[PDB]
Amino acid sequence: MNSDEVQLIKKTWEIPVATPTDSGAAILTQFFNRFPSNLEKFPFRDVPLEELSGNARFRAHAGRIIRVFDESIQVLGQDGDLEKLDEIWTKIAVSHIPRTVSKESYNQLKGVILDVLTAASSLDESQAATWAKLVDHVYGIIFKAIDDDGNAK
Ligand code: HEM
Ligand SMILES: [C-]#N
Ligand SMILES: [Cl-]
Ligand SMILES: [Cl-]
Ligand SMILES: [Mg+2]
Numbered sequence: 001m002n003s004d005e006v007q008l009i010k011k012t013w014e015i016p017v018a019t020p021t022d023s024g025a026a027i028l029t030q031f032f033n034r035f036p037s038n039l040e041k042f043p044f045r046d047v048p049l050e051e052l053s054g055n056a057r058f059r060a061h062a063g064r065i066i067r068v069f070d071e072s073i074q075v076l077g078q079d080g081d082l083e084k085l086d087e088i089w090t091k092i093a094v095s096h097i098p099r100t101v102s103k104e105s106y107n108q109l110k111g112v113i114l115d116v117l118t119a120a121s122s123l124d125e126s127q128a129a130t131w132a133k134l135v136d137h138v139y140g141i142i143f144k145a146i147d148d149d150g151n152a153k
Helices: 003-017 020-034 036-041 056-075 081-099 103-120 125-143
Strands: none
Touching: 003 020, 003 056, 003 103, 003 125, 020 036, 020 056, 020 103, 036 103, 056 081, 081 125, 103 125
16 A cells, blocks of 8 residues: 555554554454354353453453554554564464464454444545555455465465
């Protein structure tokens, strides 16, 4: 993406990153409510959906997923940002391989993340398309590490 696109992503990210736990909670809540198969991968799998948003593990995990995005967005536009993104997102792919996270499951979360960010930052259609470019980019990095079922390629 170009400099203007990088600008727009940094600027609009300011809103959801202001509240990392809440933003990550929105992502996770919507993910699990729409695609609960994925909840079985997590150690809090047995916590009822009604109690999940108050669970300490869920809340801390919310921050963890936002931190990855924040680190990624900070490096955007830096010299060697492509290589730095490759490192960040290959590390994500490798840590999820033992969890057998399928491409289908990654793509389920992809749509949720874009929906949550579109809402949070009141993105219009052109701004949302810019975000989709970034997310498609980092997904390409994940997907080159894995087969369709989430095993090492
Ligand atoms: C954008 C995609 C994703 C991001 C950035 C992401 C990020 C993270 C991070 C930062 C962690 C904690 C550190 C680590 O283990 O490396 C983690 C843990 C985890 N992720 Fe993901 N993840 C993604 C997608 C997924 C998907 C699609 C699933 C499918 C269920 C998943 C399942 C898990 C599991 C089960 C854990 C362990 C959670 C815990 O022990 O509390 N992740 N993820
Ligand atoms: C992973 N959340
Ligand atoms: Cl927060
Ligand atoms: Cl499901
Ligand atoms: Mg501002």
